[PDB]
Amino acid sequence: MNIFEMLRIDEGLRLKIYKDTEGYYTIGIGHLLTKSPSLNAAKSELDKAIGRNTNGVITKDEAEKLFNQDVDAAVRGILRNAKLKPVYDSLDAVRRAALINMVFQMGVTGVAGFTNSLRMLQQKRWDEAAVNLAKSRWYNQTPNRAKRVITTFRTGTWDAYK
Ligand SMILES: [Cl-]
């Protein structure tokens, strides 16, 4: 298991524009295109991202390229953030992946927001963190996924993704 596989499971793969759990326009492997409710806005962001006139549809390869860019950006985002880097540096590899997953879904800013949990993570207080992390909209809105990530922080293993 690795971050790529992990995330491919949590986000799925879709080759035509679609709406995420928040009703936003996305494609590929959780690649967010726009929060604009406008589908043409979406198609516009898409062609721009791909480098061609897609007409809302992309190939596998294409999606994979997006994904690669997106994991990369998420790591880097993490390392460039003053609240997050330290956390990341204190964790083990599996747990690092868990952190990366959260940033890929909700962004730096959003994860940087979980102050208390970050601290707990930093202290390696796993059960405490798990609980605290569960007290969030994230958990309430996307429970199966959040449960998987949380368990990952809690156990430091991949069992949730079996
Ligand atoms: Cl879910």
UniProtKB/Swiss-Prot annotation:
Inducing stimuli: Expressed late in the viral replication.
Catalytic machinery residues: E11, D20
Compartments in which it is found: Host cytoplasm
Effect of E11 to A/F/H/M/N: Complete loss of enzymatic activity
Record's GO cellular component terms: host cell cytoplasm
Binding site for substrate: L32, F104, S117, N132
Function: Endolysin with lysozyme activity that degrades host peptidoglycans and participates with the holin and spanin proteins in the sequential events which lead to the programmed host cell lysis releasing the mature viral particles. Once the holin has permeabilized the host cell membrane, the endolysin can reach the periplasm and break down the peptidoglycan layer.
Family named by the database record: Belongs to the glycosyl hydrolase 24 family.
This protein's name: Endolysin
Originating organism: Enterobacteria phage T4 (Bacteriophage T4)
Gene: E
